[PDB]
Design an enzyme around this catalytic site. Structure first.
Site, PDB file in Angstrom:
ATOM      1  CG  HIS D  53       3.654 -10.128   3.776  1.00 30.43           C
ATOM      2  ND1 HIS D  53       4.414  -9.260   4.527  1.00 30.43           N
ATOM      3  CD2 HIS D  53       2.854  -9.352   3.008  1.00 30.43           C
ATOM      4  CE1 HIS D  53       4.093  -8.018   4.227  1.00 30.43           C
ATOM      5  NE2 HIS D  53       3.148  -8.046   3.307  1.00 30.43           N
ATOM      6  CB  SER D  76       8.685 -12.874   2.384  1.00 29.56           C
ATOM      7  OG  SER D  76       7.711 -12.304   3.253  1.00 29.56           O
ATOM      8  CB  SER D  81       5.977 -10.806   6.756  1.00 28.18           C
ATOM      9  OG  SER D  81       6.449 -11.147   5.463  1.00 28.18           O
ATOM     10  CG  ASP D 129       1.821  -7.155  -0.170  1.00 29.54           C
ATOM     11  OD1 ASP D 129       2.210  -6.024   0.207  1.00 29.54           O
ATOM     12  OD2 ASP D 129       1.051  -7.876   0.508  1.00 29.54           O
ATOM     13  CD  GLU D 154      -1.687  -8.594  -1.505  1.00 33.20           C
ATOM     14  OE1 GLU D 154      -0.813  -9.044  -0.729  1.00 33.20           O
ATOM     15  OE2 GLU D 154      -2.745  -9.203  -1.783  1.00 33.20           O
ATOM     16  CG  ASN D 179      -5.587  -1.369  -1.441  1.00 30.62           C
ATOM     17  OD1 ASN D 179      -5.532  -1.766  -0.279  1.00 30.62           O
ATOM     18  ND2 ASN D 179      -6.046  -0.175  -1.763  1.00 30.62           N
ATOM     19  CE  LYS D 184      -5.779  -5.598   0.191  1.00 26.14           C
ATOM     20  NZ  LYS D 184      -4.917  -4.442   0.540  1.00 26.14           N
ATOM     21  CG  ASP D 188      -6.371  -7.160   3.517  1.00 25.99           C
ATOM     22  OD1 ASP D 188      -5.974  -6.798   4.647  1.00 25.99           O
ATOM     23  OD2 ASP D 188      -5.604  -7.633   2.643  1.00 25.99           O
ATOM     24  CG  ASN D 189      -6.637  -2.380   3.391  1.00 29.08           C
ATOM     25  OD1 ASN D 189      -6.547  -3.467   2.821  1.00 29.08           O
ATOM     26  ND2 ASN D 189      -6.107  -1.278   2.901  1.00 29.08           N
ATOM     27  CB  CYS D 193      -5.816  -3.923  10.778  1.00 29.59           C
ATOM     28  SG  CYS D 193      -4.715  -3.816   9.367  1.00 29.59           S
ATOM     29  CG  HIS D 299       3.444  -2.195   2.901  1.00 27.07           C
ATOM     30  ND1 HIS D 299       3.993  -3.364   3.386  1.00 27.07           N
ATOM     31  CD2 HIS D 299       3.734  -2.163   1.578  1.00 27.07           C
ATOM     32  CE1 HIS D 299       4.591  -4.010   2.402  1.00 27.07           C
ATOM     33  NE2 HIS D 299       4.448  -3.303   1.293  1.00 27.07           N
ATOM     34  CG  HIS D 351      -4.862  -9.228   7.940  1.00 28.48           C
ATOM     35  ND1 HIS D 351      -5.159  -8.383   6.896  1.00 28.48           N
ATOM     36  CD2 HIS D 351      -4.271  -8.464   8.888  1.00 28.48           C
ATOM     37  CE1 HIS D 351      -4.762  -7.160   7.199  1.00 28.48           C
ATOM     38  NE2 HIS D 351      -4.220  -7.183   8.403  1.00 28.48           N
ATOM     39  CB  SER D 359      -6.740  -9.840  -0.311  1.00 26.25           C
ATOM     40  OG  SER D 359      -7.291  -9.254   0.849  1.00 26.25           O
ATOM     41  CD  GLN D 363      -2.819  -9.997  -5.552  1.00 25.76           C
ATOM     42  OE1 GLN D 363      -2.074  -9.239  -4.917  1.00 25.76           O
ATOM     43  NE2 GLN D 363      -2.757 -10.129  -6.881  1.00 25.76           N
TER      44      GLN D 363
HETATM   45  N1  LIG Z   1       0.139  -4.749   8.086  1.00 26.34           N
HETATM   46  C1  LIG Z   1      -1.040  -4.983   7.444  1.00 26.34           C
HETATM   47  O1  LIG Z   1      -1.684  -6.031   7.609  1.00 26.34           O
HETATM   48  C2  LIG Z   1      -1.687  -4.049   6.495  1.00 26.34           C
HETATM   49  C3  LIG Z   1      -2.971  -4.313   5.804  1.00 26.34           C
HETATM   50  C4  LIG Z   1      -3.473  -3.229   4.861  1.00 26.34           C
HETATM   51  C5  LIG Z   1      -2.768  -2.109   4.683  1.00 26.34           C
HETATM   52  N2  LIG Z   1      -1.513  -1.824   5.342  1.00 26.34           N
HETATM   53  C6  LIG Z   1      -0.751  -0.589   5.131  1.00 26.34           C
HETATM   54  O2  LIG Z   1      -1.176   0.389   6.064  1.00 26.34           O
HETATM   55  C7  LIG Z   1      -1.080   1.702   5.469  1.00 26.34           C
HETATM   56  C8  LIG Z   1      -2.430   2.383   5.587  1.00 26.34           C
HETATM   57  O3  LIG Z   1      -3.353   1.702   4.671  1.00 26.34           O
HETATM   58  P1  LIG Z   1      -4.855   2.187   4.545  1.00 26.34           P
HETATM   59  O4  LIG Z   1      -5.558   1.298   3.588  1.00 26.34           O
HETATM   60  O5  LIG Z   1      -5.586   2.353   5.847  1.00 26.34           O
HETATM   61  O6  LIG Z   1      -4.533   3.675   3.968  1.00 26.34           O
HETATM   62  P2  LIG Z   1      -5.516   4.913   3.942  1.00 26.34           P
HETATM   63  O7  LIG Z   1      -5.103   5.774   2.813  1.00 26.34           O
HETATM   64  O8  LIG Z   1      -6.948   4.491   3.894  1.00 26.34           O
HETATM   65  O9  LIG Z   1      -5.407   5.690   5.324  1.00 26.34           O
HETATM   66  C9  LIG Z   1      -4.192   6.276   5.796  1.00 26.34           C
HETATM   67  C10 LIG Z   1      -4.694   7.456   6.580  1.00 26.34           C
HETATM   68  O10 LIG Z   1      -3.549   8.139   7.139  1.00 26.34           O
HETATM   69  C11 LIG Z   1      -3.831   9.456   7.289  1.00 26.34           C
HETATM   70  N3  LIG Z   1      -2.562  10.107   7.447  1.00 26.34           N
HETATM   71  C12 LIG Z   1      -1.622  10.313   6.482  1.00 26.34           C
HETATM   72  N4  LIG Z   1      -0.551  10.944   6.932  1.00 26.34           N
HETATM   73  C13 LIG Z   1      -0.853  11.141   8.277  1.00 26.34           C
HETATM   74  C14 LIG Z   1      -0.122  11.761   9.325  1.00 26.34           C
HETATM   75  N5  LIG Z   1       1.078  12.297   9.164  1.00 26.34           N
HETATM   76  N6  LIG Z   1      -0.700  11.804  10.583  1.00 26.34           N
HETATM   77  C15 LIG Z   1      -1.950  11.242  10.745  1.00 26.34           C
HETATM   78  N7  LIG Z   1      -2.682  10.650   9.815  1.00 26.34           N
HETATM   79  C16 LIG Z   1      -2.081  10.632   8.605  1.00 26.34           C
HETATM   80  C17 LIG Z   1      -4.484   9.748   5.944  1.00 26.34           C
HETATM   81  O11 LIG Z   1      -5.217  10.968   5.955  1.00 26.34           O
HETATM   82  C18 LIG Z   1      -5.395   8.532   5.740  1.00 26.34           C
HETATM   83  O12 LIG Z   1      -6.764   8.716   6.147  1.00 26.34           O
HETATM   84  C19 LIG Z   1      -0.561   1.480   4.050  1.00 26.34           C
HETATM   85  O13 LIG Z   1       0.860   1.646   4.022  1.00 26.34           O
HETATM   86  C20 LIG Z   1      -0.922   0.037   3.770  1.00 26.34           C
HETATM   87  O14 LIG Z   1      -0.078  -0.544   2.754  1.00 26.34           O
HETATM   88  C21 LIG Z   1      -0.995  -2.793   6.234  1.00 26.34           C
HETATM   89  N1  LIG Z   2      -1.728 -13.684   6.534  1.00 20.90           N
HETATM   90  C1  LIG Z   2      -1.250 -12.817   5.566  1.00 20.90           C
HETATM   91  N2  LIG Z   2      -0.730 -13.285   4.398  1.00 20.90           N
HETATM   92  C2  LIG Z   2      -0.243 -12.449   3.412  1.00 20.90           C
HETATM   93  C3  LIG Z   2      -0.257 -11.083   3.559  1.00 20.90           C
HETATM   94  C4  LIG Z   2      -0.762 -10.528   4.698  1.00 20.90           C
HETATM   95  C5  LIG Z   2      -1.283 -11.374   5.758  1.00 20.90           C
HETATM   96  N3  LIG Z   2      -1.701 -10.571   6.734  1.00 20.90           N
HETATM   97  C6  LIG Z   2      -1.506  -9.367   6.403  1.00 20.90           C
HETATM   98  N4  LIG Z   2      -0.935  -9.264   5.176  1.00 20.90           N
HETATM   99  C7  LIG Z   2      -0.620  -7.950   4.596  1.00 20.90           C
HETATM  100  C8  LIG Z   2      -1.553  -7.510   3.484  1.00 20.90           C
HETATM  101  O1  LIG Z   2      -2.901  -7.746   3.885  1.00 20.90           O
HETATM  102  C9  LIG Z   2      -1.349  -5.993   3.157  1.00 20.90           C
HETATM  103  O2  LIG Z   2      -0.005  -5.550   2.806  1.00 20.90           O
HETATM  104  C10 LIG Z   2      -2.292  -5.610   2.071  1.00 20.90           C
HETATM  105  O3  LIG Z   2      -2.225  -4.489   1.607  1.00 20.90           O
HETATM  106  O4  LIG Z   2      -3.232  -6.498   1.612  1.00 20.90           O
END
Ligand SMILES: NC(=O)c1ccc[n+]([C@@H]2O[C@H](COP(=O)([O-])OP(=O)(O)OC[C@H]3O[C@@H](n4cnc5c(N)ncnc54)[C@H](O)[C@@H]3O)[C@@H](O)[C@H]2O)c1
Ligand SMILES: Nc1nccc2c1ncn2C[C@@H](O)[C@@H](O)C(=O)O
Ligand SMILES: NC(=O)c1ccc[n+]([C@@H]2O[C@H](COP(=O)([O-])OP(=O)(O)OC[C@H]3O[C@@H](n4cnc5c(N)ncnc54)[C@H](O)[C@@H]3O)[C@@H](O)[C@H]2O)c1
Ligand SMILES: NC(=O)c1ccc[n+]([C@@H]2O[C@H](COP(=O)([O-])OP(=O)(O)OC[C@H]3O[C@@H](n4cnc5c(N)ncnc54)[C@H](O)[C@@H]3O)[C@@H](O)[C@H]2O)c1
Ligand SMILES: NC(=O)c1ccc[n+]([C@@H]2O[C@H](COP(=O)([O-])OP(=O)(O)OC[C@H]3O[C@@H](n4cnc5c(N)ncnc54)[C@H](O)[C@@H]3O)[C@@H](O)[C@H]2O)c1
Ligand SMILES: Nc1nccc2c1ncn2C[C@@H](O)[C@@H](O)C(=O)O
Ligand SMILES: Nc1nccc2c1ncn2C[C@@H](O)[C@@H](O)C(=O)O
Ligand SMILES: Nc1nccc2c1ncn2C[C@@H](O)[C@@H](O)C(=O)O
EC number: 3.13.2.1
Lengths: 430, 430, 430, 430
Positions: D53, D76, D81, D129, D154, D179, D184, D188-189, D193, D299, D351, D359, D363
């Site tokens: 992104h 990206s 994003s 990513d 990541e 990741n 991280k 981060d996660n 969030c 994601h 974030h 993170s 990286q």
């Molecule tokens: N948008 C963002 O900023 C951002 C940041 C980090 C991660 N992510 C993404 O979010 C997703 C989750 O990441 P994470 O680190 O928390 O993963 P994670 O593996 O820690 O947790 C996912 C959870 O989902 C549960 N799960 C799976 N299938 C399910 C279902 N059908 N119903 C209910 N629960 C279910 C799993 O048991 C697990 O505990 C990933 O795709 C990751 O890439 C997005």
């Molecule tokens: N400000 C930012 N810049 C770049 C990436 C950003 C972001 N916020 C969330 N992600 C998404 C990631 O944190 C996520 O896909 C991951 O797994 O680290």
């Protein structure tokens, strides 16, 4: 006479209307007021001059007053608080609204003066937030004073000013303290700021709250809400207070309580929720850590000494609207938000609709009381009856799916209160 | 006449005294009252008959009243609330105290009657908690009514009863509502129970709060404190309320709000903080999950229908003092705590000292007001002035190391209030 | 040979049994292990020598191992941690248990030695908590080393010691790290202490947590749980750490992170959750505020320098068992708890049953693995497979009424994992 | 060959640069990497093709890699994003960046292909990513596969895909799982969030979180962060999970855990943090309360069935970019956010910088390891050493003013670890 209205861009009306549509579904209190009084038009014959931030929620309020037979002319009570798409919808709706974001102290006053005169006569009702409209009429248009049936204040400071006016025999029209209804104060001030403070800070700086030292001045309802919001994100909140009671509360909540003189050297984010002047002075600014974010959320902009920043900083660079970064002689940067004005309304969209519905419902109720039952309110500042206060809370229970319990005749008897009748004494603080 | 005192075991005095020693260091308000009035003895000539749970904190209160020149005779207002080592210390100190843990409704009454008469005359002052002493004198000893200078009530229910007494013209002596001081209500009721509720539940059952569904009846100050305590440990709190405002607050705090009729089928722990009868009935008990822990924290034991348990359970087995496990026909067990009486005081040691210092300081102030300035309080129920309320909070700031801010002449002027003068209007709810 | 058992009072058996009854209903994991393996008796032929605090939960564990066909001889791993009514129940149940509260370093060792020899031979299995039993056998009874099929350690420090033993080639029997199962570590250490820390502090001092500065040493799972428990009551928690990651976590959670050298001057309550020596020294004690409550919750009593207190305090006065108040030359008092030993187990009843069920279920599983599948564990320290780890969590879902979701064949396919198969990679930290 | 870059508007560069300026002061880790390696230029000779992104934080990352002697071409990994002012600053800085907000699946792919070829040859490094760049090269440009020194993933899903690639012998270049570094993942996660979820929801709908039922799918790190964020504002969070361990954690935290099939009828706000398909289907949509806000933060955009909404809703009305309100045949409205894509990055600014610094520092470290010490990483997916992991946390301690403690030679010896050396075993989960 003058124009029918004036906004920033009427092309925003369509979008503003969709927002109003979603907004309405979030403010059950106002809609319920509409449901019950649209037919009766209890506000018929009223010419309400309103001075309250022109936002989407204030738009639903305006339209509710109208659905009740009222006639209104609006204006914002803040030069930055206006939500232009909301104003457009209102303007395009035929309501003479005179407000837009980014006015000048000059245009600000012009707008208020625009609401004083209606088609068939001057304003006979006031719906104020901050006391600007009521103070204007009182000190500049005394002639209109005797034609106004009542005032409706909703801000802590404004209501404070009203009580003062009476104390000095300056108040000349019956006023109603809407801020001090339980449903307004304990929910708007507190729950509102808890949600809209970080919104302003984030939209403006996008800073991470977690792991930062946030200094909150004042532990009143606003400070309580802000302290809570920041705490929940992982910030270490330090509180400053002048009240020993409010101070003990902060302490009992795990917040360190010190003076700004000490806290300034520690804070990473400063939030003034005080209702008074000189909270953050240059002596503090000079101590602040690099890139300290300073903002105010108390109704007025007299809490942070922005003039000092402007007259002492080595240089000032605007990052974007309502976000300035000053460089101090010490080599430390200071990020000022909304030029020291309300951060939630100036850098964000204010409080959410649901909570505004509580305050505005109280507002509509006050407008009907003062207008409809005048002889019930002699010149002075009054409160809304507890029955109405509880009715306001009740109106929002449904949306949340809360299931209230009903006292049995036996219980109601035991407690010595009515099944519906007010459930708490007048001194109850909730 | 009768004995000089009567307790469970005077051999506990030594230990009780060490507890009082540590306690004193935790109640700055009481100690400060001692510091200032020990010499003046403002309570000289007073014969205070007290009826308030006899705990370590009540011991420090008693000794404070005495240090102020008062003459007292105590008794607990609960048959289970007494802390015997604390009573022993007081008894051994020469103070006629008549209380012990585990009395019978019969002995209970005997103790109260024991405090009515002093060496040089009958009681001329009342310090009540629950209204038992004031209701006794009023309905059984009316003759003594005219010799009592004033009453001091501190319990929500008791003060509720007082207001009722006046409303019916039954109150015959000036009473002071101590429960409704901000420092008492917002801190004792709320912060107190937040700390002592789980203490009682744990000492009694040692159950894990986390991951359980805790049902709290009533969201007043007590319910607020209990709900928060349980929430903080990982329990899912469900709230039941009759008040729409208190209901909305619960909702705004993320608590589901339903009826006990529905919640009983879900709860794992039930806590009644209501001030009224029939909160948990047999119809509910029959629905409860196996081994559901039921307890009451509202001043009286009329909230849970224990009789029903006793007359419907297949069998009842006592696990230990104040802990019973009933087996229901449905094969479900139910753990009742303190026989439906105050759980924190009956299964634990009540509220911590620091918080009790707030209430008791308010208590000492009311005793001095009523005794010292009688003509200031005509027959009826009054409140302590805000100045005294803030003074009470102020007294505890030091121990916590809170640094209060002082308004500048400029600020004090802007806010229109005194640098020290009360900082909030009488309607302020904090 | 020696006696059949020895406890403090076997008259406590009846009461201990009721506690065990209630306990069983709170430990679904253990009961389910009983349900499934009572008939098969997978532990038949095993002679398990156990060294683990003898509490009600350890009693349910003992009886579970027995229901599975095992033969056991118990002893506590702490001279203060024993729950005498629980020991009585076990002793009266025919199980040779040698433990009681308040033993001497001398009797402590006698008890462990008592569990080494069974009716038909020496112990062939170890269930340790702290490594005392395994270190005893290894260094004092090497002859028995080759007859022990496996070890079962559950404490962070003990497992730490095991990894060390292997690293030096001292470990001579296969060990299983039970502490590091997700269901043990993330739940016992964290959620356990979150509940039992304040229990110990309160039962011991009955101090009010709210508004106090609580200093927690170490932000590991225990520190995390303690910091959270204190925070939830209104305390201002300051954290000290040596790990930058654990330090950042504390910061991200709003906890100030400093050194004890600095924090000692501020703290009102001190809690050591560190796994090492010299956390609170005399240099700190001399700085502490009056009546500062000091206690340790890390497995051993080497974190607080109690000797110093004993050899430098002007005088020491015992308030009651496990509660001492030292007076320092500076005129400041210091309240030491449990003589520097585990405060939750020494001043209270340890962790609640529900959470102990998780650890103990893990314990029973390791006993069966090591005993039943020996060739699967060569000499060294191993972990329980994730499948068993999830099974342990699963077993407690029912009691809490959790409704787990089941992946569809489509989802299971998309995620590339089995509908039931382990749902997380081995490096997953939860 | 093709253009030098392509963005939405290069006139945004100035503003983007001010944002980058403030951002830098919030990412100590990246700046420290710059401080130490700017001179050595450890990445000299590297041609890093990045697909992540394009936000302000990713801008600081890009410029850090360049300061270290690297050559990069960005794009990206999301069509929504991108932060255009950030992209403009990078583009105007001479860095060929090919990204802008609102691209089409077609333009998206064009941008990635644009980063594959550099002035003096094809890309020899990957910073991915989501796995799009690595999966593209692997399946479409296999020829370039042997010229790439290493991959840097990541994202949880991406890294998941990598492990899968290896498991099937498809991975042809050494990859590093960034990741799963503690700094991280746990920050981060989770913390990310916790802060950026409500930001997206608010900026998009401005809805009030308090008093609403928020349904969060999945209790992993993201779900943990989201659940916590929503809980802190007053929402009642319900959790759905497939993992029994993650389920028990939610329960121990006071969250009700059910199936979406059941929760859909209750939720007011739905958040999918799952990493898989079919979380919210039409069968659920048909049950949702009116105006239910649905969004996804996992994601990918495969968790919510948007196609269904599009093909079954009576009508769809766009409120504004990334905010659509569908009207269902049942008369219920549904507010979809960011078209089912990442809500924080699509409706907000992702974030905060501070957390992204963690993170991104990881990286940069991976880029230097893979590039600088190639023979250290054979084809497969690796982790960064704990020493580097702790270094990353350490780098952010200063900004937060955290004061880490230093083990004494005595303590280090007692614990059996180095004063600086890694402080935790590889299986430690923090
Ligand atoms: N948008 C963002 O900023 C951002 C940041 C980090 C991660 N992510 C993404 O979010 C997703 C989750 O990441 P994470 O680190 O928390 O993963 P994670 O593996 O820690 O947790 C996912 C959870 O989902 C549960 N799960 C799976 N299938 C399910 C279902 N059908 N119903 C209910 N629960 C279910 C799993 O048991 C697990 O505990 C990933 O795709 C990751 O890439 C997005
Ligand atoms: N400000 C930012 N810049 C770049 C990436 C950003 C972001 N916020 C969330 N992600 C998404 C990631 O944190 C996520 O896909 C991951 O797994 O680290
Ligand atoms: N922007 C918004 O959305 C919004 C919403 C509600 C109220 N407000 C405004 O915020 C202000 C505060 O309102 P409130 O309801 O919380 O008022 P309040 O009276 O409840 O609390 C203000 C607190 O400030 C403390 N205080 C006063 N002077 C101080 C000083 N110099 N240093 C430290 N503490 C000091 C007081 O003791 C008091 O407890 C008012 O001006 C009100 O109009 C703004
Ligand atoms: N054991 C203790 O330590 C302790 C300390 C303080 C007060 N109390 C007692 O606890 C009780 C509550 O005191 P408080 O100060 O919180 O009172 P309160 O008036 O603030 O709150 C009681 C709440 O109960 C609700 N309620 C009433 N009937 C109900 C019903 N049938 N179902 C559900 N909710 C119902 C009311 O709406 C009210 O909000 C009083 O009897 C008081 O004396 C006990
Ligand atoms: N009493 C109980 O109920 C109970 C329950 C579980 C564990 N424990 C014990 O508690 C201890 C901690 O267990 P854990 O699982 O949390 O361990 P842990 O490894 O997760 O955490 C200990 C933390 O201490 C920090 N630390 C180490 N030395 C320090 C120092 N000098 N100053 C500050 N911080 C320092 C470490 O960096 C680490 O993060 C162990 O001895 C364990 O056996 C006791
Ligand atoms: N969305 C919104 N519309 C109108 C007014 C709004 C607002 N948010 C905050 N205020 C400010 C008031 O809540 C405050 O000044 C008060 O006292 O009620
Ligand atoms: N330790 C203690 N000593 C005396 C009284 C105590 C107490 N704890 C709770 N109450 C009950 C009162 O707080 C309650 O009835 C009230 O209303 O103040
Ligand atoms: N009720 C209880 N029974 C047995 C043991 C108990 C306990 N509470 C705490 N521990 C200590 C262990 O949780 C700890 O040393 C560990 O590491 O598991």
């Amino acid at each position: 006479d003058k124009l029918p209205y004036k906004v920033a861009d009427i092309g925003l009306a369509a979008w503003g209307r969709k927002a109003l549509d979603i907004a309405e579904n979030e403010m059950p209190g106002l809609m319920r007021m509409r449901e019950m009084y649209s037919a009766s038009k209890p506000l018929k014959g009223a010419r309400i001059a309103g001075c309250l931030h022109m936002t989407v929620e204030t738009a639903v309020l305006i339209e509710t007053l109208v659905a009740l037979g009222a006639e209104v002319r609006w204006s914002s009570c803040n030069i930055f608080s206006t939500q232009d798409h909301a104003a457009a919808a209102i303007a395009k709706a035929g309501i003479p609204v005179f407000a837009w974001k980014g006015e000048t102290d000059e245009e600000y006053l012009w707008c208020i003066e625009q609401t004083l005169h209606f088609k068939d006569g001057p304003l006979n009702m006031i719906l104020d937030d901050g006391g600007d409209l009521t103070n204007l009429i009182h000190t500049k248009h005394p002639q209109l004073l005797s034609g106004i049936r009542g005032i409706s204040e909703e801000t802590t400071t404004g209501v404070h000013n009203l009580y003062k006016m009476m104390a000095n025999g300056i108040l000349k029209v019956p006023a109603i303290n809407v801020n001090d209804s339980v449903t307004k104060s304990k929910f708007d001030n507190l729950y509102g700021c808890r949600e809209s403070l970080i919104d302003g800070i984030k939209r403006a700086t996008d800073v991470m709250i977690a792991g930062k030292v946030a200094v909150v001045a004042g532990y009143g309802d606003v400070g309580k809400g802000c302290a809570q919001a920041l705490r929940g994100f992982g910030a270490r909140v330090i509180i400053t207070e002048i009240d020993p009671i409010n101070a003990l509360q902060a302490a009992m909540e795990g917040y360190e309580v010190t003076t700004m003189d000490e806290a300034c050297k520690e804070g990473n984010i400063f939030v003034t929720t005080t209702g008074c002047v000189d909270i953050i002075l240059g002596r503090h600014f000079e101590q602040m850590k690099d890139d300290a974010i300073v903002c105010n959320i108390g109704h007025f902009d007299v809490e942070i000494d922005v003039k000092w920043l402007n007259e002492n900083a080595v240089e000032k660079v605007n990052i974007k609207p309502q976000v300035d970064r000053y460089l101090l002689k010490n080599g430390h940067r200071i990020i000022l938000l909304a030029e020291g004005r309300l951060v939630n309304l100036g850098c964000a969209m204010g409080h959410p609709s649901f909570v505004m519905s509580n305050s505005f419902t109280n507002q509509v109720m006050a407008q009907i009381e003062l207008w409809t039952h005048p002889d019930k309110y002699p010149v002075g500042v009054h409160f809304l009856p507890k029955k109405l206060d509880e009715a306001v809370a009740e109106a929002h229970l449904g949306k949340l799916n809360v299931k209230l319990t009903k006292l049995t005749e036996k219980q109601a008897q035991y407690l010595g209160m009515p099944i519906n009748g007010p459930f708490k004494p007048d001194h109850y603080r909730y």
